[PDB]
Coordinates of C-alpha atoms and ligand atoms in Angstrom, one line a residue:
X1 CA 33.6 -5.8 -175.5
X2 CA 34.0 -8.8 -172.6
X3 CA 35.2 -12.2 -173.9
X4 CA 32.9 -14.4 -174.0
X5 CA 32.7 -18.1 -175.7
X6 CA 29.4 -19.6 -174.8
X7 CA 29.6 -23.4 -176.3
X8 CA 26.9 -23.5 -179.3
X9 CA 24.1 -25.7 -179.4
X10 CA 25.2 -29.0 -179.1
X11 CA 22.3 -30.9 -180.3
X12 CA 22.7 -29.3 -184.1
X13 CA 19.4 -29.6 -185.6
X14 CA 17.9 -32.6 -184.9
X15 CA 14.8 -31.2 -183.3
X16 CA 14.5 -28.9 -186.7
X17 CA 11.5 -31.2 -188.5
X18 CA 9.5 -33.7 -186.6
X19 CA 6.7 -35.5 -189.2
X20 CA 4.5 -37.0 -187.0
X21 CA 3.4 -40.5 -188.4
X22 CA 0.0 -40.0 -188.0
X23 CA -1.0 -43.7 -188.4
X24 CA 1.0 -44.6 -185.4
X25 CA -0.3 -41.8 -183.1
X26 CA -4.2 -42.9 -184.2
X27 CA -3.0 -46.4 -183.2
X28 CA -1.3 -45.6 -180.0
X29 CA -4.1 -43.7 -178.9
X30 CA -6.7 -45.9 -179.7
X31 CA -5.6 -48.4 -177.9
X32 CA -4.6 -45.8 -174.8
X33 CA -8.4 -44.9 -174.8
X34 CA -9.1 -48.4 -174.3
X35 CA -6.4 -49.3 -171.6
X36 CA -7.7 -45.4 -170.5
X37 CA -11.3 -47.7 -169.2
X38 CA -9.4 -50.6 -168.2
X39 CA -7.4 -48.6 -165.1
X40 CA -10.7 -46.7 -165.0
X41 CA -12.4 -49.1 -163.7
X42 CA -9.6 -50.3 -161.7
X43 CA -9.9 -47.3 -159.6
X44 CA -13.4 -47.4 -159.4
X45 CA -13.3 -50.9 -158.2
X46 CA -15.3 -51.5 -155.2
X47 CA -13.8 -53.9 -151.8
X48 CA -10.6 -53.0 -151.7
X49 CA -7.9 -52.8 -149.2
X50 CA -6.4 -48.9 -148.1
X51 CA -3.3 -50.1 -148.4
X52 CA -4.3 -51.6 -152.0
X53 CA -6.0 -48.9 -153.1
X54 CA -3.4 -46.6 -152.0
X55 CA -0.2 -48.5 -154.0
X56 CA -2.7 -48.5 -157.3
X57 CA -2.7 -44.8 -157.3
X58 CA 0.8 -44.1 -156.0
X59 CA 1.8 -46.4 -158.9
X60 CA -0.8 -45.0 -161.7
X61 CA 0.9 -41.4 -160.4
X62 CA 4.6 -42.6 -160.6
X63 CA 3.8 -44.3 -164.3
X64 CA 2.7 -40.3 -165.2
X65 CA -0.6 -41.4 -165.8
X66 CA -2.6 -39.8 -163.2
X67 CA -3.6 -37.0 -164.8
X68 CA -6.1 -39.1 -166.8
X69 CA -8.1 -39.7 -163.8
X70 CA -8.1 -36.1 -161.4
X71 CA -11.5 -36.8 -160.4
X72 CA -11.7 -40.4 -159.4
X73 CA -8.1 -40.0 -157.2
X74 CA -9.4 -36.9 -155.7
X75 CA -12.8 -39.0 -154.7
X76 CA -10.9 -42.1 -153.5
X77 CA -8.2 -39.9 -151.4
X78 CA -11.0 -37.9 -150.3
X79 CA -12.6 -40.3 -148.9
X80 CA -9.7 -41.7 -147.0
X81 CA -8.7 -38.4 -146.2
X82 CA -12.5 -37.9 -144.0
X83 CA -12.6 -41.6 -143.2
X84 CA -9.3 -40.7 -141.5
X85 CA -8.6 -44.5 -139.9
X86 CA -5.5 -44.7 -138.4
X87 CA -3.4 -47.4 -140.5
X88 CA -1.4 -49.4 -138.1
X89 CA 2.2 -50.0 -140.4
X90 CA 4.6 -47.2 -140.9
X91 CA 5.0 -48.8 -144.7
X92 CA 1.0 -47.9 -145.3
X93 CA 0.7 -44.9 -142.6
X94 CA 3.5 -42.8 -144.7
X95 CA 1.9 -43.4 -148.3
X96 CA -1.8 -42.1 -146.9
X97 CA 0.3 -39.6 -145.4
X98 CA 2.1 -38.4 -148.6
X99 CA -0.6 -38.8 -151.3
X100 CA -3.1 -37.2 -149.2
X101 CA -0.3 -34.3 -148.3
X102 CA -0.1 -33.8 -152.1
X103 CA -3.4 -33.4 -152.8
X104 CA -3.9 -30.8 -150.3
X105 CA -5.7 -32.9 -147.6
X106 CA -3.9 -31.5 -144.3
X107 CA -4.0 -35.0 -142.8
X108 CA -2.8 -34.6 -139.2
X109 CA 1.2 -36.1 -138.8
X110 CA -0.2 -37.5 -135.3
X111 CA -0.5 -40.5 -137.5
X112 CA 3.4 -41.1 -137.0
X113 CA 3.3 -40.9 -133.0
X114 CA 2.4 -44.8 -132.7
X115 CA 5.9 -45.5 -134.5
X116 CA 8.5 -43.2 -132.4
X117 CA 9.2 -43.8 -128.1
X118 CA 8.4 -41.4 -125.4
X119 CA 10.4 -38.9 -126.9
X120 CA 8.9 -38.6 -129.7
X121 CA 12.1 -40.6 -131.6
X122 CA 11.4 -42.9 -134.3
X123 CA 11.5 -46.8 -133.1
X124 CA 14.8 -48.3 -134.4
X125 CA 13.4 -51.2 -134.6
X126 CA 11.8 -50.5 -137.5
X127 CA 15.4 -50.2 -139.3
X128 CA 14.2 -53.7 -140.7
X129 CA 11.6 -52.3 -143.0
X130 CA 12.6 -51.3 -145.8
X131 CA 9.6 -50.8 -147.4
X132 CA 8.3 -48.7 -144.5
X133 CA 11.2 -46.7 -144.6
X134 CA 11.4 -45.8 -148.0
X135 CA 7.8 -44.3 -147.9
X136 CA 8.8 -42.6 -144.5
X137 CA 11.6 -41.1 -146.3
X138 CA 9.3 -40.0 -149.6
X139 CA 7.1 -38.5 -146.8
X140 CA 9.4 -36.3 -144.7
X141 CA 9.7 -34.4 -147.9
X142 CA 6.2 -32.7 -148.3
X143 CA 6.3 -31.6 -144.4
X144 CA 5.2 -28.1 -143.2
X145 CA 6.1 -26.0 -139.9
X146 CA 4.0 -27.7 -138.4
X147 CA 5.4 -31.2 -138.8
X148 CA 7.6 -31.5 -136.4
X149 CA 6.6 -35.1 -135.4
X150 CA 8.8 -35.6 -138.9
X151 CA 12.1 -33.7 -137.7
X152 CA 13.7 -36.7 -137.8
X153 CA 12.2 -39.0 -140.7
X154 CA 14.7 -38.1 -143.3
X155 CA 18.0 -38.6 -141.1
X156 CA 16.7 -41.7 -139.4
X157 CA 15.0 -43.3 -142.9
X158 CA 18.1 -42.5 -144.3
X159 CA 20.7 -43.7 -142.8
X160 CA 19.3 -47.0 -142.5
X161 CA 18.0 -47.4 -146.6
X162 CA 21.7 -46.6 -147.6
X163 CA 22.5 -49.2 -145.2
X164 CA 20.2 -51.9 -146.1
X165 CA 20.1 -50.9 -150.0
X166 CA 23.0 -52.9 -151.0
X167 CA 21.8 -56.2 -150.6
X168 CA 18.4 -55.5 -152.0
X169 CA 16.5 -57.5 -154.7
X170 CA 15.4 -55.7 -158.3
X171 CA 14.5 -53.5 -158.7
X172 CA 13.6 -52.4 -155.0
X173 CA 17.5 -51.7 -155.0
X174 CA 17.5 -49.1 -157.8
X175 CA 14.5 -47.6 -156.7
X176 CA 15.6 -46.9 -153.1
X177 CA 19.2 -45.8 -154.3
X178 CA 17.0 -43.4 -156.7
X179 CA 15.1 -42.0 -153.9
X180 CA 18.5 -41.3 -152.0
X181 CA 19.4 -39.4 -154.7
X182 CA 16.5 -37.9 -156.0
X183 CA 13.1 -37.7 -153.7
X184 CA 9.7 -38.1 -155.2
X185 CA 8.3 -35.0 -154.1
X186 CA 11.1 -32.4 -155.7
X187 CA 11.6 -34.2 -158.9
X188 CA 10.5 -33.1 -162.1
X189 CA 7.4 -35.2 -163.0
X190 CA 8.2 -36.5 -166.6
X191 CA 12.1 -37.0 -165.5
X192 CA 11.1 -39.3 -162.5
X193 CA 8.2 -40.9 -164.6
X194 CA 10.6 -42.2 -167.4
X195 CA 12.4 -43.4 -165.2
X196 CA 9.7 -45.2 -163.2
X197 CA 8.5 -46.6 -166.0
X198 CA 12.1 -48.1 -167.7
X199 CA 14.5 -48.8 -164.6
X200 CA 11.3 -50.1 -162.3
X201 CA 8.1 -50.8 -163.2
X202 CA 8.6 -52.6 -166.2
X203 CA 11.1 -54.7 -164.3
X204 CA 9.0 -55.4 -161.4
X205 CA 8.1 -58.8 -161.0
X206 CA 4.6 -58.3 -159.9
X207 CA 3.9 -55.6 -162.6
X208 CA 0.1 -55.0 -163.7
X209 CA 0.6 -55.2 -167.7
X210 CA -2.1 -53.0 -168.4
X211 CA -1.2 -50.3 -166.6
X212 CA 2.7 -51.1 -167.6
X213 CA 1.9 -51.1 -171.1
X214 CA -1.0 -47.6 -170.3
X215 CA 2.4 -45.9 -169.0
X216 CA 5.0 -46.6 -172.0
X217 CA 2.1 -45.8 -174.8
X218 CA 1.0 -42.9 -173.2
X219 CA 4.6 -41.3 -172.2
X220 CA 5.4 -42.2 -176.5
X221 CA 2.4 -40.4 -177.6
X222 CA 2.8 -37.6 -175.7
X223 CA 6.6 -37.7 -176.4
X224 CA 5.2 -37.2 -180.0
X225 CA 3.4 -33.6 -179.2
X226 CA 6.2 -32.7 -177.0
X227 CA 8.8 -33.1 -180.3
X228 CA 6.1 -31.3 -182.4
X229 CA 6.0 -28.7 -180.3
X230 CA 9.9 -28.0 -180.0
X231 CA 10.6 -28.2 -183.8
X232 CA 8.5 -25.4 -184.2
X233 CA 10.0 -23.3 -181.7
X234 CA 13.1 -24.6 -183.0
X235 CA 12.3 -22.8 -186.7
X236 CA 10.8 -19.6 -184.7
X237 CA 14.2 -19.0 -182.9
X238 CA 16.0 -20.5 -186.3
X239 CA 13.7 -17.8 -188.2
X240 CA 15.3 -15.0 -185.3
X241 CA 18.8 -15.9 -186.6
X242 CA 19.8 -14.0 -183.2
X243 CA 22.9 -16.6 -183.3
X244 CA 24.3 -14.3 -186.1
X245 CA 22.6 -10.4 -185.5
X246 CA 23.2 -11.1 -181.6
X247 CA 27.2 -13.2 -181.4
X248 CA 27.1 -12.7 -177.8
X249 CA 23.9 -14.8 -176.9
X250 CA 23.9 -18.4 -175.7
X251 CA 21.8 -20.8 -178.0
X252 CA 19.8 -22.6 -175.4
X253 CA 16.2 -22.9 -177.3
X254 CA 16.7 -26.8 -176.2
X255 CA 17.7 -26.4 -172.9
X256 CA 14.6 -23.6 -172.4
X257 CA 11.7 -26.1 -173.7
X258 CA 12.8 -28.7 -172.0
X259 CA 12.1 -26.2 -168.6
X260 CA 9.2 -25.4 -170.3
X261 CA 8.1 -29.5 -170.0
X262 CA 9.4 -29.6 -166.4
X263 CA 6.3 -26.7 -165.2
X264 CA 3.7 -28.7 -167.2
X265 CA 3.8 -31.9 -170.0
X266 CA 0.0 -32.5 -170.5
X267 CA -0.9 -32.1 -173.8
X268 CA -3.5 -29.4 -173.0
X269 CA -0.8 -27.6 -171.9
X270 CA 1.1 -27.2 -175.3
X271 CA -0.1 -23.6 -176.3
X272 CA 1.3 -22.7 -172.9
X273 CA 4.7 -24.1 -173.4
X274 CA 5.5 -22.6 -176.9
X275 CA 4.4 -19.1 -175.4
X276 CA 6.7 -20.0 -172.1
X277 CA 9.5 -21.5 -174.1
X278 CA 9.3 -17.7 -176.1
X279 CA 9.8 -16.2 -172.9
X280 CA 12.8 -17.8 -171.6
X281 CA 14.5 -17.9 -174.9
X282 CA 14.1 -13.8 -174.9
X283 CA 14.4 -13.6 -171.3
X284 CA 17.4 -15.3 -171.7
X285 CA 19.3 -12.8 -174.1
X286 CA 18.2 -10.2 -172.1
X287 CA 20.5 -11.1 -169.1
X288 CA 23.7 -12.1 -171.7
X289 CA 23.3 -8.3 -172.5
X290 CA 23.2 -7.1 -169.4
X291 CA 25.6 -10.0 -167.7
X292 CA 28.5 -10.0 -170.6
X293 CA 28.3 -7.2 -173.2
X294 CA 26.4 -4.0 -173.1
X295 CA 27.9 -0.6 -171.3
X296 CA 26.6 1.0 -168.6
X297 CA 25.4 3.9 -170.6
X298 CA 23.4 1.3 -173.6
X299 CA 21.9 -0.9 -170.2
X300 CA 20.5 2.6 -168.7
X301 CA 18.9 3.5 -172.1
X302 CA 18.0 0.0 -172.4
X303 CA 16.2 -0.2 -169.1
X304 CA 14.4 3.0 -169.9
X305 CA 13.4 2.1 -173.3
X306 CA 11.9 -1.0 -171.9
X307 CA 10.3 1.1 -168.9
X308 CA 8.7 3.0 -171.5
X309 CA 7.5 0.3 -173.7
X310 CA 7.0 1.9 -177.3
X311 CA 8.7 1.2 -181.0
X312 CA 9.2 4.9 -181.6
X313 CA 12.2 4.2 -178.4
X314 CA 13.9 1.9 -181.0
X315 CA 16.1 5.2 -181.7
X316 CA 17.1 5.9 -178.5
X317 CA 19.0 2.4 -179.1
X318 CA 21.8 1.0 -180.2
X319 CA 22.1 -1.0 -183.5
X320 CA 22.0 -4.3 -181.5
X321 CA 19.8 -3.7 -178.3
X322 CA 17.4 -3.0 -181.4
X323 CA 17.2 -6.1 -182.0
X324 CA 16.4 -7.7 -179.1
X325 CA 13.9 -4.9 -178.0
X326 CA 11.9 -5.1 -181.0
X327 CA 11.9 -8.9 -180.6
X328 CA 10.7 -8.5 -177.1
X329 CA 8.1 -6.1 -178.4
X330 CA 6.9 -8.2 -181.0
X331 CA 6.9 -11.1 -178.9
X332 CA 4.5 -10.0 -176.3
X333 CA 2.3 -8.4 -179.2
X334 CA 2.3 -11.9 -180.9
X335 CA 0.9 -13.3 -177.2
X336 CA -1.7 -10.8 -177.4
X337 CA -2.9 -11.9 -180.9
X338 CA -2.4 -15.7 -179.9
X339 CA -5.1 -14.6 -176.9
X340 CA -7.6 -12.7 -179.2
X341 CA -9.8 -15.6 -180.6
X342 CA -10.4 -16.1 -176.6
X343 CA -10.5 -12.8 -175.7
X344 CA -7.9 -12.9 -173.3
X345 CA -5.3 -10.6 -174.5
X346 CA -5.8 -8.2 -171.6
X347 CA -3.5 -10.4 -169.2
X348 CA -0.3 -10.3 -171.5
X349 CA 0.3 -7.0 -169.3
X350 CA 0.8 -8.3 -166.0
X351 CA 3.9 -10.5 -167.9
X352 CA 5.0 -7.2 -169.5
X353 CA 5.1 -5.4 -165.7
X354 CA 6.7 -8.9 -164.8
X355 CA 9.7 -8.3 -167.5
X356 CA 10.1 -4.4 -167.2
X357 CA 10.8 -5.1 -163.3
X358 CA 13.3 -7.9 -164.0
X359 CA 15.1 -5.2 -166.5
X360 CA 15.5 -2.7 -163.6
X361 CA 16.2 -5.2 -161.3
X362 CA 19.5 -6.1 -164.1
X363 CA 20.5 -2.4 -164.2
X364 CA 20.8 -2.3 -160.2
X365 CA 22.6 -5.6 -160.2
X366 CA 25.0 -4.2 -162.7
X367 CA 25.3 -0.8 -161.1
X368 CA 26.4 -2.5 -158.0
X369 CA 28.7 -4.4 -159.7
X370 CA 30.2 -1.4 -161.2
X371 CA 30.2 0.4 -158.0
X372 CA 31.6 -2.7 -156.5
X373 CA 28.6 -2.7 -153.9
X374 CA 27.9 -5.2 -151.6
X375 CA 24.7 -4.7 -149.8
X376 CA 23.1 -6.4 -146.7
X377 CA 21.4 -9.9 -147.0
X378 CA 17.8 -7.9 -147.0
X379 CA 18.9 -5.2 -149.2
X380 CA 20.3 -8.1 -151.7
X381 CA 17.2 -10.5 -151.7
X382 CA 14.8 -7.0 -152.9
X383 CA 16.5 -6.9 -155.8
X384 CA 17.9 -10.2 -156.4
X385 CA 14.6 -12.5 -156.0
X386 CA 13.1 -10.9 -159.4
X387 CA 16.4 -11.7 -161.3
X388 CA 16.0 -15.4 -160.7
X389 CA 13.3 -14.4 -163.2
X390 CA 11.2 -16.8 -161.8
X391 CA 8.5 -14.1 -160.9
X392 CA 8.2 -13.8 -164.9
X393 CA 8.1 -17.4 -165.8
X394 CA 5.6 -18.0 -163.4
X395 CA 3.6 -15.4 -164.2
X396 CA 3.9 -16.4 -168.1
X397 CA 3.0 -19.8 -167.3
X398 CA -0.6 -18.7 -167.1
X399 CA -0.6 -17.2 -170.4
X400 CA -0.9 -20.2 -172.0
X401 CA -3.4 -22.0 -169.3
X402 CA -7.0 -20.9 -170.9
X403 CA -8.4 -21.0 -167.3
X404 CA -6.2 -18.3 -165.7
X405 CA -8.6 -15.4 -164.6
X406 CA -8.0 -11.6 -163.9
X407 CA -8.1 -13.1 -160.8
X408 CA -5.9 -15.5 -160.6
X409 CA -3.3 -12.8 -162.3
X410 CA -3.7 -10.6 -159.5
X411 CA -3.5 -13.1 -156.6
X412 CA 0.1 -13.9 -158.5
X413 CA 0.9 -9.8 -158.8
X414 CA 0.8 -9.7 -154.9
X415 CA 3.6 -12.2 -154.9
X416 CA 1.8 -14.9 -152.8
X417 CA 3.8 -16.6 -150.4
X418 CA 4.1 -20.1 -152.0
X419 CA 5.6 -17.8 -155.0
X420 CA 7.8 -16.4 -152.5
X421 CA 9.0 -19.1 -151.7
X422 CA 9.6 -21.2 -155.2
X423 CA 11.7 -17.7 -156.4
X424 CA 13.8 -18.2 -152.9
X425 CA 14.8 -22.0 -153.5
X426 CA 15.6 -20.6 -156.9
X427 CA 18.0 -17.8 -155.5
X428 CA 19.4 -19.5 -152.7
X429 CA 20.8 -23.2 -154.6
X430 CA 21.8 -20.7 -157.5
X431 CA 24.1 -18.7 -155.3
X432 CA 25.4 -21.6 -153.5
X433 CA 26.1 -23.1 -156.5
X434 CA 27.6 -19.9 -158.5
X435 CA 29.3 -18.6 -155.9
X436 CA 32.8 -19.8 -156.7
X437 CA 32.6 -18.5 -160.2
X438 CA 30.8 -15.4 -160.0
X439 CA 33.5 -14.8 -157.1
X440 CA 36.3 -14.6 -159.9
X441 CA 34.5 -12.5 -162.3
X442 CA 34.9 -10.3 -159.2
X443 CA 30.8 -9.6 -158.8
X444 CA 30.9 -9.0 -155.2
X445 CA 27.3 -8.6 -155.2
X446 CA 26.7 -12.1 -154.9
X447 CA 24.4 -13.8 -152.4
X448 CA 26.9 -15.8 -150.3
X449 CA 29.0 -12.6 -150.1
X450 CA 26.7 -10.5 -148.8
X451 CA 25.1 -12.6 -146.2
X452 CA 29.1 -13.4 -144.9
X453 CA 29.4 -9.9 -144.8
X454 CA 26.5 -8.4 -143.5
X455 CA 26.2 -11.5 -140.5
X456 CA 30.3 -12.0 -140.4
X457 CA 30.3 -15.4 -141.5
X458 CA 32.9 -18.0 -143.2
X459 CA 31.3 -18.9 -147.0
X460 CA 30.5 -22.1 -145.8
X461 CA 28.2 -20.7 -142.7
X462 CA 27.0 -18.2 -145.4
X463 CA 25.9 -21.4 -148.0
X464 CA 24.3 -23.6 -144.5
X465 CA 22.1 -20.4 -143.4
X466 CA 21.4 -20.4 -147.3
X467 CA 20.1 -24.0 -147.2
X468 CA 18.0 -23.5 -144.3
X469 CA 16.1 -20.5 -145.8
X470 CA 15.2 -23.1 -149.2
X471 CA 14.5 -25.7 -146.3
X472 CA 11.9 -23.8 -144.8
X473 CA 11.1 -22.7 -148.8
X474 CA 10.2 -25.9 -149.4
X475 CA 7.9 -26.0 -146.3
X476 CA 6.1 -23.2 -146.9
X477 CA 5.5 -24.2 -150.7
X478 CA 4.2 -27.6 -149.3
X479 CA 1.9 -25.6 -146.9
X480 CA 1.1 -23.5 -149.6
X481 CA -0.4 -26.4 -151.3
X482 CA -3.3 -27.2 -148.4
X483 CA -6.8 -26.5 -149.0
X484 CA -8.8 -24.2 -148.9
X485 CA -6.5 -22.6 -151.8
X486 CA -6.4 -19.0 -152.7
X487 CA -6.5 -20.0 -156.1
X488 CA -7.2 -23.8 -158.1
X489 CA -4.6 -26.0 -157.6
X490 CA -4.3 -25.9 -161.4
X491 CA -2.3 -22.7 -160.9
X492 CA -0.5 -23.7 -157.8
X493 CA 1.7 -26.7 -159.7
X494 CA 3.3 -24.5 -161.9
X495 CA 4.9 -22.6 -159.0
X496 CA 5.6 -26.0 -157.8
X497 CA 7.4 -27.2 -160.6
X498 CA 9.5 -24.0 -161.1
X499 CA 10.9 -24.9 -157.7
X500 CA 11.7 -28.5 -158.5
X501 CA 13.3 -27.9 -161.6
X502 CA 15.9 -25.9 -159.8
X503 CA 16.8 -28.3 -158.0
X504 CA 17.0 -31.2 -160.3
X505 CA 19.3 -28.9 -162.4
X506 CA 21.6 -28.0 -159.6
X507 CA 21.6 -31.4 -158.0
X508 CA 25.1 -31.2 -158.0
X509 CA 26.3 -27.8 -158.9
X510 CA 26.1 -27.3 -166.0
X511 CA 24.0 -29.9 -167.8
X512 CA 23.2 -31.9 -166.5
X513 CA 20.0 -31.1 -168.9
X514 CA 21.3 -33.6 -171.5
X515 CA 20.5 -37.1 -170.4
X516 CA 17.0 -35.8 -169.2
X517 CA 16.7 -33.9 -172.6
X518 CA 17.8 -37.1 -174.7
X519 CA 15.5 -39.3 -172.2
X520 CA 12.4 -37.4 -173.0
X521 CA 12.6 -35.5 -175.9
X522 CA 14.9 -37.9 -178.2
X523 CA 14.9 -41.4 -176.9
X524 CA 11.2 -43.2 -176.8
X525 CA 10.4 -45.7 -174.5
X526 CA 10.9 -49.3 -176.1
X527 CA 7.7 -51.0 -175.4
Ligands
FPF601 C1 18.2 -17.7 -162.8 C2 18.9 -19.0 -163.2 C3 20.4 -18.9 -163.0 C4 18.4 -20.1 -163.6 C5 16.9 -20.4 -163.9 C6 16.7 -21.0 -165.3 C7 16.2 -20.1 -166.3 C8 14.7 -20.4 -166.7 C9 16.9 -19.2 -166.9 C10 16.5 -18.2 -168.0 C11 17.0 -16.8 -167.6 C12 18.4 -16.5 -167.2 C13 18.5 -15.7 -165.9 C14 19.5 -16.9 -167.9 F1 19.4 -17.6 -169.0 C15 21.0 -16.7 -167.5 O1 21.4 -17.4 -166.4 P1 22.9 -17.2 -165.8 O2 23.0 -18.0 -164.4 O3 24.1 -17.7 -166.9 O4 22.9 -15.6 -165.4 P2 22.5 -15.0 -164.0 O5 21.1 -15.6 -163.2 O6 23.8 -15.1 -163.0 O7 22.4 -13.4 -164.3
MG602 MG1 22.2 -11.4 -165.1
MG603 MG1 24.4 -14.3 -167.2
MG604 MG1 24.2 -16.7 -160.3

């Protein structure tokens, strides 16, 4: 058997039991409802400047509080969006840009022309405004193919924030050293909200105190669910005891609810997580099996078993794969019974036909390896795209969501192109990342390898065509996003969020996870 020594959980049991003290969640929500109508009306409030109305919900999004009021942004942006005035400062002109980009709106980029020469160059004169280049910079991020105006808004914003940042007042310097490491747009939400709310906002000078004190009783609240909800998950993989039966897989429950947060934190949400969180988790054995312990010979008969999808199989398997694959069966039969009362167990399926092609996609990858195969960039990607296992997350995601359709299932079975693209970012930062290592372990069938091979090109070449294809990735995900929608926007985040948490977690190419773990599922946020 390979030697393996995967680190055990290092957070223990502290996420075990969480009593929820009732009397302070009644308070802190009664007085959220309250605060809830204050910013209501706030938004509703008639008179006011664009670029007033604009920074109120740019800073109700950033405090994580936006998702209170869908409707009354979508109206307010709407209306900018059709009353499509050109703004005449680049600080102004980038936020409508941005927010209304988000949201779908395909505002035109011809709003940009007015601040770049003949050549379509940005004016360096505007080097001197900070504040209009950090919301240049925030923009250039959610740009399609056909924002090309923007081809230079992230080098030339750049340069000059890192060069003006230093002598910055508070917290505008933290903030714009943030954004330099960590856009808006590709962050997770709840990780950039916390700290919004702590390392800015609440040290901002000018801060409204309503909406200050909304964001940190709101974020604690929901805190409060999101602790509920992974101390029972904690007892269901507890009560699995696969740390014993199953030595050779990692103990990563933590790690996998807190990915589960990064796709979606709102609290109508929570069924979905604890069935997404299941899926990971399982998921997650599945590839220790495959990556560091079973033979050839079990993986094939695994592979088929789970082709053929039936307990009497159990047999045909070892002691151990019995385990899991009764797991796995019970698992999906549990999502099924979790769907009943609604009557929508008939979409569990389309995960199971999501997991029994990431399976065979494992037994290729492993053949390969055995046969010490390299194949060619295309030949790689068809196999190696579904072992990202993003195509099953995403697909699970919806579970959960009690508005996902037949529909809306089948539109994600045709794997849609922003889903093509989120499972791509996922691949390509993964392989530039894991290349060294995987290297040594002698898997030749690695992504950087075969693209030097099949185009004859150094590793580093290899790793810059690599970025390009999650470049355009990103561009197509943000086009992806425009309306008219194949399917609600509700479904389209998810996808979304899948991508951004890859690249929050490689940022740097381990964890990584922890501080975000211990920043929003240990630590509260002192009011
Ligand atoms: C696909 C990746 C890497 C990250 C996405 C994060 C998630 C949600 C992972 C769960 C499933 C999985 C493939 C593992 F746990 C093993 O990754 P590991 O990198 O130790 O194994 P391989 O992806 O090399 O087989
Ligand atoms: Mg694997
Ligand atoms: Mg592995
Ligand atoms: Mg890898």
């Amino acid at each position: 058997r390979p030697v393996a020594d995967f680190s055990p959980s290092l957070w223990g049991d502290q996420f075990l039991s969480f009593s929820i003290k009732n009397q302070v969640a009644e308070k802190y929500a009664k007085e959220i409802e309250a605060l809830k109508e204050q910013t209501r009306n706030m938004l509703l409030a008639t008179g006011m400047k664009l670029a007033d109305t604009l920074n109120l919900i740019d800073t109700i999004e950033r405090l994580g509080i936006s998702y209170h009021f869908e409707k009354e942004i979508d109206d307010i942006l709407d209306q900018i969006y059709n009353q499509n005035s050109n703004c005449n400062d680049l600080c102004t002109s980038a936020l409508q840009f941005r927010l209304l980009r988000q949201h779908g709106f395909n505002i035109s980029p011809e709003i940009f022309s007015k601040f770049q020469d003949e050549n379509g160059k940005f004016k360096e004169s505007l080097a001197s405004d900070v504040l209009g280049l950090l919301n240049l910079y925030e923009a250039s991020h959610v740009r399609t193919h056909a924002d090309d105006i923007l081809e230079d808004a992230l080098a030339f914003s750049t340069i000059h924030l890192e060069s003006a940042a230093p002598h910055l007042k508070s917290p505008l310097r933290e903030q714009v050293t943030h954004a330099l490491e960590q856009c808006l747009h590709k962050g997770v939400p709840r990780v950039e909200t916390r700290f919004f709310i702590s390392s800015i906002y609440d040290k901002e000078q000018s801060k409204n105190n309503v909406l200050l004190r909304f964001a940190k009783l709101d974020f604690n609240l929901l805190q409060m669910l999101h602790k509920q909800e992974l101390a029972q998950v904690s007892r269901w993989w507890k009560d699995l005891d696969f740390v014993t039966t199953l030595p050779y897989a990692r103990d990563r429950v933590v790690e996998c609810y807190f990915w589960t947060l990064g796709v979606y934190f709102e609290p109508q949400y929570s069924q979905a997580r604890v069935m997404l969180v299941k899926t990971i988790s399982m998921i997650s054995i599945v590839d220790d099996t495959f990556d560091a312990y079973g033979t050839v010979k079990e993986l094939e008969a695994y592979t088929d078993a789970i082709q053929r999808w039936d307990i009497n199989e159990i047999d045909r398997l070892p002691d151990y794969m019995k385990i899991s694959y009764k797991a796995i069966l019970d698992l999906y039969k549990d999502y099924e019974k979790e769907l009943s009362s609604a009557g929508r167990s008939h979409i569990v399926c389309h995960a199971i036909e999501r997991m029994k092609e990431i399976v065979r996609n494992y037994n290729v990858e492993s053949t390969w390896f055995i046969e010490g195969y390299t194949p060619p960039v295309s030949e790689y990607l068809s196999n190696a795209l579904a072992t990202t296992t993003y195509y099953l997350l995403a697909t699970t995601s919806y579970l959960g969501m009690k508005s996902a359709t037949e529909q809306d299932f089948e539109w994600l079975s045709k794997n849609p192109k922003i889903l093509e693209a989120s499972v791509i970012i996922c691949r390509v930062i993964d392989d530039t990342a894991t290349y060294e290592v995987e290297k040594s372990r002698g898997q030749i069938a690695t992504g950087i390898e075969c693209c030097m091979r099949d185009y004859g090109i150094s590793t580093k070449e290899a790793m810059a065509k690599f970025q390009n294809m999650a470049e355009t990735a990103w561009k197509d995900i943000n086009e992806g996003l425009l309306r008219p929608t194949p399917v609600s926007t509700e479904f389209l985040t998810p996808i979304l969020n899948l991508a951004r948490i890859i690249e929050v977690t490689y940022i740097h190419n381990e964890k990584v996870l922890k501080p975000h773990i211990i920043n929003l599922l240990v630590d509260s946020i002192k009011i």
